[PDB]
Amino acid sequence: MRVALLGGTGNLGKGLALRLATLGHEIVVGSRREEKAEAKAAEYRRIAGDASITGMKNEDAAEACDIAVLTIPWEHAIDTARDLKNILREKIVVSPLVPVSRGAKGFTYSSERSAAEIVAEVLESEKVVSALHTIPAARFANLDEKFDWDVPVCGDDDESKKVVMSLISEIDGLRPLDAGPLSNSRLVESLTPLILNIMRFNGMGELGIKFL
Amino acid sequence: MRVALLGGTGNLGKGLALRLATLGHEIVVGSRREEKAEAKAAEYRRIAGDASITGMKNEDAAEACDIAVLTIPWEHAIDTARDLKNILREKIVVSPLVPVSRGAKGFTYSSERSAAEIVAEVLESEKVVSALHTIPAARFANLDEKFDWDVPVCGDDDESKKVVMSLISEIDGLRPLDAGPLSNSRLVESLTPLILNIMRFNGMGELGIKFL
Ligand SMILES: C[C@H](OP(=O)(O)OC[C@@H](O)[C@@H](O)[C@@H](O)Cn1c2nc(=O)[nH]c(=O)c-2cc2ccc(O)cc21)C(=O)N[C@@H](CCC(=O)N[C@@H](CCC(=O)O)C(=O)O)C(=O)O
Ligand SMILES: C[C@H](OP(=O)(O)OC[C@@H](O)[C@@H](O)[C@@H](O)Cn1c2nc(=O)[nH]c(=O)c-2cc2ccc(O)cc21)C(=O)N[C@@H](CCC(=O)N[C@@H](CCC(=O)O)C(=O)O)C(=O)O
Ligand SMILES: NC(=O)c1ccc[n+]([C@@H]2O[C@H](COP(=O)([O-])OP(=O)(O)OC[C@H]3O[C@@H](n4cnc5c(N)ncnc54)[C@H](OP(=O)(O)O)[C@@H]3O)[C@@H](O)[C@H]2O)c1
Ligand SMILES: NC(=O)c1ccc[n+]([C@@H]2O[C@H](COP(=O)([O-])OP(=O)(O)OC[C@H]3O[C@@H](n4cnc5c(N)ncnc54)[C@H](OP(=O)(O)O)[C@@H]3O)[C@@H](O)[C@H]2O)c1
Ligand code: NA
Ligand code: NA
């Protein structure tokens, strides 16, 4: 399928672009600046080898795709989603957004409502799927890295969720697990600050999670 | 050491009793009813083989221990801790309590403040350690069961946390991980409703978690 990675010029965007493009999916890296998206798309094609990855401004990337992933810091992702609502309302939108803050006593979940539900509200869409919150970007983007991670996925539209889970499942080392309706997104997003605390208090590097 | 399992006649108490008793610890199963605790202790002794396991009413078990684990449904566990506060304030108290509600649309976290922090306030004690929330009872109680799970542990008292983590570590298949101060207990407790949702929406059996 055609997958747009909005703000795909960054940390999580690189890993998704590399992993999905090598599986043959057509990737569009979106950026606030066309030249930056083009530059990153070129860098990603070079690393991946055989790959269809094109760069364009976010608005054009959103228009071109079937599925859009918001790989943007959450507070800004909400504004970008608002900007693009007439385009994105009709597409599958994946939210990997995590409202997390740091503090003297550790990392905390920083919102009273889940980021994914906030996005669904801004877009006035029933096709928001929440996923990818527990995939550490650096390890994910390292094509030499080996991992075995589970990816909880939430959402209210059965078809949209099925498409996203199927896509995630194609990536070797990832296993998507249905966590229910979008109202469970807070439980999924909360996994990230928990993981960051485990890393902090046990002196461990980047971690994902597995249910077993 | 001497470990009391308050409400240890139930699901989680059984597995803790069998695993810890075989490791040589003195176990006291507590119940609201003396006869029920004694009957369960007899059942547990039969299964574990050579082991020191006895049963008493909760108030007597709390008095006769060094570490007390609250293996009671969360709201009632808090009332029980309040009733036994003069005894428990002086012990290491382990809270595996999870505020979870099984709803029509899924499982939800049902408290604003974490269960562990509420117990700590009722006891006016800094020796409360939050742990064991993600250990599925039936699989844990099956002594033939093979498993590899991580156990996040929170608490504000270093010594108490160290004691509990050491105790958990003795059990083959369990790896305790420091998750920081007790203020992070809500993130740990929230793992349970997330797991229950995954079991429900993917049609899976009992699951634990691993950070990798
Ligand atoms: C710049 C980069 O990241 P950083 O600035 O340290 O980032 C700190 C954090 O943001 C980083 O730990 C995040 O992944 C934390 N994090 C999240 N952080 C957030 O702020 N929000 C999130 O939603 C998020 C989720 C998440 C999920 C799971 C998890 O384990 C961690 C998560 C970094 O330091 N890179 C490493 C190297 C990373 C790497 O993979 N490099 C390559 C080699 C590259 C070369 O050859 O030079 C490799 O190791 O093979 C380094 O320079 O030491
Ligand atoms: C179907 C039923 O149970 P179930 O739905 O299979 O089990 C669901 C869960 O409670 C169980 O998986 C728990 O471990 C879930 N669970 C937690 N459940 C919680 O309630 N709280 C927790 O904190 C919790 C944490 C947890 C951690 C990880 C994980 O994977 C699961 C966790 C069942 O087995 N019941 C018995 C009967 C029980 C009963 O009382 N029946 C009656 C007789 C009924 C008759 O006449 O048929 C009787 O015994 O009196 C049976 O039919 O075999
Ligand atoms: N890092 C992780 O390990 C990780 C893991 C799981 C989930 N996530 C989540 O995924 C999202 C992306 O994280 P990330 O680490 O990839 O972020 P990032 O690298 O810090 O930023 C990604 C991109 O967002 C764009 N951006 C920055 N400010 C913006 C603004 N004001 N408006 C629009 N776009 C803006 C930039 O692209 P342009 O400059 O090209 O426009 C940037 O490259 C976050 O919500 C995070 O919670 C991250
Ligand atoms: N089941 C799991 O897989 C699991 C896993 C991790 C954590 N936990 C947590 O551990 C705790 C215990 O779970 P559990 O499944 O073992 O529970 P449970 O079997 O339903 O109940 C445990 C015991 O609590 C006592 N009890 C019940 N109602 C009570 C009340 N109103 N007042 C006082 N005591 C009462 C009973 O003992 P007496 O009748 O003998 O007094 C009962 O045997 C919970 O907080 C739960 O969230 C459970
Ligand atoms: Na896969
Ligand atoms: Na162990």
XYZ file of C-alpha atoms and ligand atoms in Angstrom:
628
model
C 0.000 0.000 0.000
C 0.977 3.662 -0.118
C 2.052 4.794 3.338
C 2.708 8.401 4.252
C 4.935 9.085 7.268
C 4.076 12.655 8.314
C 7.141 14.162 9.933
C 8.844 11.000 8.606
C 12.177 12.815 8.504
C 12.695 12.026 12.200
C 13.535 9.144 14.568
C 10.512 6.843 14.337
C 9.882 7.788 10.705
C 13.291 6.494 9.598
C 12.699 3.019 11.048
C 9.216 2.670 9.634
C 10.409 3.845 6.208
C 13.333 1.396 6.122
C 11.352 -1.628 7.398
C 8.269 -1.083 5.247
C 10.045 -0.065 2.047
C 12.163 -3.208 1.983
C 8.903 -5.211 2.162
C 7.866 -3.476 -1.050
C 5.441 -0.864 0.247
C 5.489 2.564 -1.362
C 6.558 5.080 1.248
C 6.103 8.833 1.184
C 8.208 10.763 3.677
C 6.355 13.938 4.673
C 7.984 17.074 5.983
C 7.118 20.706 6.650
C 9.800 21.345 3.959
C 9.813 19.553 0.591
C 13.618 19.679 0.328
C 14.108 18.068 3.737
C 11.637 15.273 2.888
C 13.432 14.720 -0.450
C 16.819 14.593 1.316
C 15.641 12.087 3.917
C 13.853 9.963 1.319
C 17.188 9.800 -0.577
C 19.069 8.847 2.595
C 16.504 6.108 3.365
C 16.530 4.651 -0.179
C 20.328 4.453 -0.009
C 20.293 2.524 3.286
C 17.437 0.203 2.364
C 18.680 -0.824 -1.063
C 15.700 -1.746 -3.184
C 12.959 0.712 -2.192
C 10.247 3.098 -3.403
C 10.518 6.101 -1.030
C 9.598 9.598 -2.153
C 9.667 12.831 -0.212
C 7.049 15.600 -0.271
C 5.536 18.236 1.969
C 3.133 16.793 4.547
C 0.013 18.027 2.769
C 0.971 16.368 -0.503
C 2.054 13.183 1.310
C -1.326 13.036 3.074
C -3.137 13.466 -0.249
C -1.068 10.712 -1.893
C -1.446 7.956 0.721
C -3.949 5.314 1.767
C -2.548 5.138 5.333
C -0.862 8.057 7.162
C 1.327 7.669 10.297
C 1.757 10.739 12.530
C 5.462 10.435 13.433
C 5.469 13.901 15.048
C 5.836 14.987 18.760
C 2.273 14.812 20.073
C 1.525 18.479 20.803
C 2.558 19.430 17.248
C 0.944 16.333 15.741
C -2.469 17.580 16.906
C -1.984 20.911 15.046
C -0.756 19.130 11.898
C -3.731 16.760 12.010
C -6.044 19.815 12.326
C -4.324 21.449 9.307
C -4.887 18.302 7.265
C -8.252 17.203 8.568
C -10.183 17.415 5.285
C -7.615 15.133 3.678
C -6.927 12.811 6.605
C -10.537 12.347 7.738
C -11.057 9.896 4.856
C -7.849 7.886 5.337
C -6.532 5.400 7.868
C -4.489 7.465 10.335
C -2.080 5.688 12.662
C -1.279 7.423 15.964
C 2.022 6.330 17.693
C 1.706 9.520 19.815
C 2.746 9.328 23.500
C 2.013 12.165 26.004
C 5.010 11.663 28.321
C 6.829 14.089 30.613
C 9.974 13.664 32.678
C 10.226 14.565 36.351
C 12.465 14.189 39.381
C 10.672 10.976 40.301
C 10.523 9.490 36.836
C 8.494 9.694 33.657
C 4.754 10.327 33.820
C 1.776 10.060 31.453
C 1.033 13.707 30.696
C -2.550 13.826 29.467
C -6.023 13.345 30.922
C -7.280 11.935 27.571
C -5.311 9.635 25.264
C -3.461 11.263 22.383
C -5.157 8.929 19.880
C -8.633 9.875 21.024
C -7.661 13.575 20.884
C -6.556 13.018 17.258
C -9.800 11.189 16.430
C -11.665 14.238 17.771
C -9.626 16.790 15.807
C -10.091 14.770 12.615
C -13.732 13.949 13.277
C -12.734 10.451 12.146
C -13.608 6.899 13.122
C -10.514 5.575 11.284
C -7.788 6.418 13.774
C -5.757 3.374 14.826
C -3.440 3.631 17.829
C -0.162 1.721 17.553
C 3.657 1.611 17.674
C 4.170 3.370 21.006
C 6.570 0.784 22.398
C 8.955 0.488 19.438
C 12.277 2.184 20.402
C 13.333 4.257 17.382
C 17.134 3.788 17.348
C 17.014 0.005 17.646
C 14.120 -0.176 15.205
C 16.045 1.824 12.584
C 19.155 -0.372 12.902
C 18.770 -2.941 10.128
C 21.382 -5.157 11.811
C 19.372 -5.159 15.068
C 17.328 -8.226 16.015
C 14.191 -7.910 18.169
C 11.038 -9.716 19.239
C 8.400 -7.160 20.183
C 4.634 -7.054 20.559
C 2.659 -4.021 19.343
C -0.716 -3.423 21.080
C -3.148 -1.887 18.579
C -6.421 -0.071 19.445
C -9.167 1.357 17.302
C -12.913 1.540 16.725
C -13.097 0.713 13.012
C -12.679 -3.014 12.441
C -11.489 -2.740 8.844
C -8.961 0.043 9.523
C -7.552 -1.849 12.521
C -7.281 -5.078 10.485
C -5.343 -3.276 7.721
C -2.931 -1.752 10.247
C -2.385 -4.969 12.147
C -1.715 -6.785 8.879
C 0.834 -4.168 7.884
C 2.654 -4.338 11.218
C 2.625 -8.145 11.123
C 4.590 -8.120 7.840
C 7.580 -6.687 9.692
C 9.814 -9.468 10.994
C 10.175 -9.192 14.766
C 6.832 -7.405 15.333
C 3.597 -9.094 16.394
C 0.495 -6.864 16.567
C -2.090 -7.635 19.288
C -5.625 -6.238 19.312
C -6.099 -4.277 22.558
C -9.688 -3.282 21.789
C -11.474 0.058 21.213
C -9.752 3.432 20.980
C -10.929 4.044 24.585
C -8.139 1.636 25.610
C -5.467 3.831 23.967
C -4.544 5.405 27.285
C -3.555 1.967 28.608
C -1.394 1.342 25.519
C 0.210 4.805 25.445
C 0.961 4.498 29.161
C 3.285 1.592 28.395
C 5.895 4.048 27.167
C 6.454 6.071 30.333
C 6.507 2.737 32.211
C 9.235 1.457 29.873
C 11.210 4.717 30.183
C 11.079 4.327 33.988
C 12.302 0.700 33.770
C 15.199 1.921 31.608
C 15.999 4.753 34.014
C 15.838 2.812 37.254
C 17.646 -0.348 36.056
C 20.238 1.321 33.868
C 19.041 -0.447 30.746
C 19.119 0.652 27.127
C 16.095 0.794 24.782
C 13.408 -1.791 25.369
C 10.223 -3.015 23.760
C 7.771 -5.410 25.391
C 6.467 -8.950 24.820
C 3.355 -10.668 26.252
C 4.041 -14.303 27.096
C 11.747 -15.200 56.095
C 8.217 -15.137 57.455
C 5.605 -14.173 54.886
C 1.915 -13.718 55.558
C -0.496 -13.872 52.582
C -3.569 -11.937 53.719
C -6.551 -13.328 51.804
C -4.014 -16.037 50.839
C -6.838 -18.545 50.388
C -7.483 -17.223 46.886
C -6.030 -17.248 43.393
C -2.781 -15.344 43.809
C -2.193 -16.497 47.392
C -2.001 -20.126 46.294
C 0.851 -19.600 43.826
C 2.808 -17.383 46.209
C 2.379 -19.940 48.990
C 3.571 -22.868 46.902
C 6.536 -21.053 45.227
C 7.836 -19.395 48.379
C 7.322 -22.345 50.724
C 9.359 -24.665 48.489
C 12.118 -22.066 48.682
C 12.194 -22.499 52.453
C 10.244 -19.440 53.609
C 7.731 -19.685 56.482
C 4.274 -18.998 55.034
C 1.190 -17.996 56.970
C -2.034 -18.069 54.970
C -4.504 -15.505 56.287
C -8.294 -15.527 55.968
C -11.285 -13.756 57.378
C -12.122 -17.243 58.709
C -9.686 -19.291 60.775
C -10.990 -22.650 59.467
C -10.735 -21.585 55.829
C -7.113 -20.487 56.260
C -6.299 -23.767 58.002
C -8.002 -25.775 55.247
C -6.147 -23.944 52.482
C -2.828 -24.279 54.354
C -3.475 -28.088 54.476
C -4.208 -28.097 50.725
C -1.047 -26.120 50.038
C 1.158 -28.281 52.254
C -0.096 -31.367 50.407
C 0.874 -29.903 47.021
C 4.201 -28.302 47.987
C 5.423 -31.349 49.863
C 8.015 -30.461 52.505
C 7.271 -26.885 53.523
C 6.339 -24.651 56.438
C 2.790 -23.366 55.697
C 0.121 -22.719 58.324
C -3.163 -20.779 58.327
C -4.767 -18.273 60.727
C -7.203 -15.349 60.655
C -5.703 -12.317 58.842
C -5.130 -10.310 62.019
C -3.128 -13.180 63.571
C -1.207 -13.823 60.316
C -0.290 -10.085 60.049
C 1.141 -10.208 63.574
C 3.102 -13.410 62.816
C 5.141 -12.228 59.811
C 7.936 -9.948 58.623
C 6.437 -9.311 55.150
C 2.662 -9.193 54.526
C 1.288 -9.546 50.969
C -2.216 -8.211 50.335
C -3.739 -10.911 48.095
C -7.254 -9.486 48.336
C -9.400 -7.600 45.703
C -8.239 -3.978 45.853
C -11.084 -2.107 47.553
C -11.397 -4.748 50.248
C -7.603 -4.997 50.561
C -7.537 -1.286 51.433
C -10.246 -1.728 54.091
C -8.371 -4.714 55.495
C -5.119 -2.721 55.640
C -6.992 0.044 57.468
C -8.353 -2.438 60.041
C -4.899 -3.921 60.602
C -2.951 -0.677 60.325
C -1.371 -0.761 63.790
C 0.149 -4.135 62.949
C 0.964 -3.585 59.274
C 2.557 -0.148 59.648
C 5.580 -1.907 61.139
C 5.947 -4.614 58.448
C 7.043 -4.627 54.829
C 3.683 -4.657 52.987
C 3.566 -5.888 49.406
C 0.739 -4.550 47.264
C -0.131 -6.595 44.101
C -3.444 -4.672 44.090
C -4.991 -3.716 40.770
C -7.913 -1.251 40.467
C -9.456 -2.919 37.412
C -13.076 -3.010 36.235
C -14.322 -5.575 33.680
C -16.652 -3.461 31.524
C -18.900 -4.090 28.552
C -16.434 -2.465 26.140
C -13.248 -3.631 27.830
C -11.176 -3.549 31.017
C -10.457 -0.152 32.576
C -8.196 1.198 35.338
C -10.630 2.156 38.094
C -8.899 4.575 40.435
C -7.378 8.025 40.170
C -4.647 7.371 42.749
C -2.817 4.040 42.562
C -3.913 1.265 44.903
C -0.410 1.045 46.359
C -0.305 4.746 47.245
C -3.751 4.527 48.855
C -2.613 1.600 51.022
C 0.585 3.487 51.976
C -1.520 6.477 53.121
C -3.943 4.333 55.160
C -0.956 2.735 56.928
C 1.065 5.983 57.176
C 4.015 3.805 56.159
C 6.860 4.207 53.684
C 7.457 0.428 53.720
C 4.829 -0.424 51.094
C 6.238 -2.127 47.979
C 4.134 -2.432 44.833
C 4.777 -5.636 42.853
C 3.324 -8.806 41.262
C 0.486 -7.219 39.313
C 1.268 -8.985 36.088
C 1.745 -12.547 37.337
C -1.269 -14.616 36.098
C -2.510 -16.675 39.060
C -3.429 -20.004 37.448
C -0.235 -20.360 35.450
C 1.751 -19.182 38.469
C 0.122 -21.826 40.711
C 0.838 -24.670 38.271
C 4.136 -26.024 39.568
C 4.720 -27.762 36.228
C 4.241 -24.396 34.455
C 7.166 -22.945 32.499
C 7.392 -19.139 32.352
C 9.733 -16.155 31.868
C 8.229 -12.976 33.303
C 9.392 -9.590 34.481
C 7.989 -8.018 37.647
C 8.114 -4.215 37.913
C 8.602 -3.127 41.548
C 7.909 0.363 43.008
C 8.441 1.794 46.459
C 9.863 4.744 48.411
C 11.893 2.780 50.938
C 15.129 1.379 49.487
C 15.643 -1.327 52.066
C 12.094 -2.673 51.805
C 12.192 -2.639 48.018
C 15.549 -4.480 48.039
C 14.146 -7.144 50.354
C 11.091 -7.678 48.143
C 13.061 -7.692 44.887
C 15.447 -10.259 46.406
C 12.531 -12.416 47.443
C 10.983 -12.240 43.964
C 14.301 -12.989 42.292
C 14.570 -16.284 44.212
C 11.637 -17.574 42.189
C 12.761 -19.254 38.963
C 11.105 -17.572 35.988
C 10.662 -14.181 37.654
C 12.928 -11.157 37.191
C 12.168 -8.098 39.332
C 12.856 -4.669 37.795
C 12.972 -1.382 39.709
C 10.226 0.961 38.378
C 11.108 3.760 40.820
C 9.162 5.498 43.617
C 5.696 4.436 44.694
C 4.418 7.400 42.629
C 4.997 5.235 39.520
C 2.693 2.490 40.772
C -0.231 3.642 38.652
C 1.796 2.904 35.492
C 2.658 -0.578 36.786
C -0.892 -1.342 37.988
C -2.215 -0.232 34.592
C -0.386 -3.074 32.877
C -3.026 -5.475 34.181
C -6.120 -3.981 32.556
C -4.014 -3.679 29.339
C -3.168 -7.402 29.520
C -6.771 -8.379 30.255
C -7.856 -6.394 27.191
C -5.289 -8.139 24.992
C -6.466 -11.536 26.255
C -10.064 -10.603 25.490
C -9.612 -9.047 22.077
C -7.081 -11.532 20.668
C -8.522 -14.587 22.280
C -5.446 -15.398 24.323
C -4.904 -17.225 27.583
C -3.134 -15.852 30.682
C -0.180 -13.630 29.925
C 2.715 -12.047 31.758
C 5.168 -9.467 30.333
C 8.829 -9.231 29.428
C 10.897 -6.118 28.670
C 13.439 -6.858 25.957
C 19.981 10.666 19.055
C 19.641 9.258 19.546
O 18.569 9.333 20.514
P 18.599 10.053 21.934
O 18.651 11.504 21.719
O 19.574 9.384 22.793
O 17.173 9.710 22.436
C 16.744 9.568 23.781
C 15.291 9.017 23.730
O 14.463 9.894 22.945
C 15.204 7.552 23.146
O 15.757 6.660 24.135
C 13.742 7.124 22.794
O 13.666 5.966 21.945
C 12.870 6.939 24.061
N 11.478 6.529 23.757
C 10.582 7.576 23.453
N 10.901 8.894 23.701
C 10.026 9.888 23.588
O 10.397 11.038 23.862
N 8.728 9.627 23.179
C 8.329 8.314 22.857
O 7.173 8.129 22.487
C 9.278 7.245 22.983
C 8.880 5.883 22.950
C 9.782 4.815 23.256
C 9.392 3.449 23.172
C 10.203 2.405 23.726
C 11.506 2.782 24.242
O 12.422 1.887 24.691
C 11.964 4.111 24.228
C 11.121 5.160 23.736
C 20.887 8.580 20.112
O 21.418 9.003 21.138
N 21.483 7.709 19.303
C 22.427 6.715 19.802
C 22.685 5.655 18.728
C 21.423 4.969 18.232
C 21.696 3.943 17.150
O 20.913 3.013 16.960
N 22.742 4.176 16.364
C 23.213 3.187 15.400
C 24.619 3.547 14.918
C 24.699 4.851 14.147
C 26.114 5.177 13.710
O 26.741 4.326 13.044
O 26.596 6.283 14.032
C 23.224 1.784 15.997
O 23.393 1.695 17.231
O 23.468 0.844 15.212
C 23.745 7.368 20.208
O 24.171 8.314 19.513
O 24.333 6.923 21.216
C -14.170 -19.024 33.229
C -13.653 -18.770 34.651
O -12.434 -18.008 34.635
P -11.674 -17.417 33.401
O -12.551 -16.424 32.768
O -11.168 -18.521 32.586
O -10.459 -16.671 34.116
C -10.245 -15.256 33.983
C -9.252 -14.594 34.975
O -9.835 -14.366 36.238
C -7.795 -15.104 35.173
O -7.207 -15.429 33.909
C -6.861 -14.123 35.949
O -5.516 -14.630 36.043
C -6.824 -12.731 35.286
N -5.913 -11.715 35.880
C -6.398 -10.872 36.879
N -7.698 -10.889 37.247
C -8.148 -10.072 38.211
O -9.328 -10.145 38.542
N -7.341 -9.141 38.853
C -5.994 -9.087 38.585
O -5.291 -8.319 39.233
C -5.490 -9.944 37.535
C -4.135 -9.888 37.127
C -3.662 -10.748 36.068
C -2.326 -10.690 35.643
C -1.968 -11.257 34.360
C -2.928 -12.040 33.624
O -2.656 -12.651 32.433
C -4.230 -12.290 34.150
C -4.602 -11.633 35.382
C -13.418 -20.096 35.360
O -12.438 -20.789 35.080
N -14.178 -20.325 36.425
C -14.246 -21.642 37.041
C -15.415 -21.702 38.025
C -15.333 -20.693 39.158
C -16.513 -20.791 40.104
O -16.494 -20.224 41.197
N -17.495 -21.601 39.722
C -18.486 -22.123 40.655
C -19.248 -23.283 40.008
C -19.925 -22.916 38.696
C -20.616 -24.095 38.044
O -21.551 -24.652 38.659
O -20.225 -24.464 36.918
C -17.850 -22.592 41.958
O -16.635 -22.881 41.930
O -18.462 -22.321 43.013
C -14.413 -22.724 35.978
O -15.475 -22.738 35.319
O -13.483 -23.542 35.816
N 11.455 8.071 19.432
C 10.859 6.930 19.810
O 11.567 6.051 20.292
C 9.406 6.751 19.674
C 8.839 5.463 19.860
C 7.504 5.224 19.789
C 6.674 6.276 19.507
N 7.171 7.561 19.301
C 6.267 8.661 18.979
O 6.279 8.985 17.601
C 6.246 10.400 17.396
C 7.519 10.847 16.704
O 8.639 10.677 17.554
P 10.073 10.979 16.922
O 10.990 10.572 18.019
O 10.284 10.445 15.558
O 10.113 12.565 16.852
P 11.187 13.604 16.310
O 12.212 12.904 15.554
O 11.604 14.480 17.451
O 10.333 14.520 15.327
C 9.787 13.918 14.154
C 9.469 15.000 13.162
O 8.425 15.847 13.574
C 8.535 17.038 12.763
N 8.174 18.235 13.551
C 8.860 18.875 14.590
N 8.224 19.952 15.014
C 7.086 20.022 14.232
C 6.000 20.940 14.165
N 5.920 22.012 14.956
N 5.017 20.710 13.256
C 5.071 19.634 12.441
N 6.061 18.731 12.442
C 7.037 18.979 13.351
C 9.978 17.091 12.172
O 9.880 16.916 10.743
P 10.035 18.108 9.656
O 11.043 18.997 10.282
O 10.601 17.375 8.495
O 8.712 18.748 9.417
C 10.613 15.916 12.866
O 11.598 15.276 12.042
C 6.008 11.009 18.778
O 4.628 11.348 19.005
C 6.470 9.969 19.785
O 5.698 9.933 20.974
C 8.555 7.844 19.375
N -5.734 -13.383 39.885
C -4.593 -12.895 39.330
O -4.185 -13.423 38.275
C -3.888 -11.764 39.921
C -2.604 -11.412 39.442
C -1.891 -10.347 39.907
C -2.438 -9.582 40.892
N -3.700 -9.880 41.422
C -4.244 -9.058 42.491
O -4.070 -9.680 43.750
C -5.229 -9.510 44.577
C -5.909 -10.849 44.839
O -6.334 -11.460 43.623
P -6.956 -12.896 43.692
O -7.295 -13.211 42.265
O -6.135 -13.859 44.452
O -8.361 -12.675 44.421
P -9.539 -13.623 44.869
O -9.057 -14.995 44.750
O -10.820 -13.205 44.231
O -9.731 -13.255 46.409
C -8.639 -13.476 47.310
C -9.204 -13.495 48.695
O -9.659 -12.233 49.141
C -10.548 -12.498 50.255
N -11.694 -11.578 50.142
C -12.687 -11.540 49.180
N -13.563 -10.607 49.405
C -13.127 -10.000 50.575
C -13.644 -8.934 51.360
N -14.760 -8.302 51.031
N -12.952 -8.568 52.481
C -11.813 -9.202 52.829
N -11.260 -10.231 52.151
C -11.985 -10.570 51.026
C -10.927 -14.001 50.207
O -10.271 -14.677 51.318
P -11.027 -15.128 52.667
O -12.439 -15.385 52.195
O -10.266 -16.360 53.005
O -10.938 -14.020 53.682
C -10.353 -14.419 48.879
O -9.922 -15.798 48.914
C -6.102 -8.497 43.828
O -5.873 -7.158 44.253
C -5.732 -8.646 42.365
O -5.880 -7.464 41.617
C -4.471 -10.976 40.964
Na 5.918 -9.949 12.088
Na 14.287 -15.477 39.375
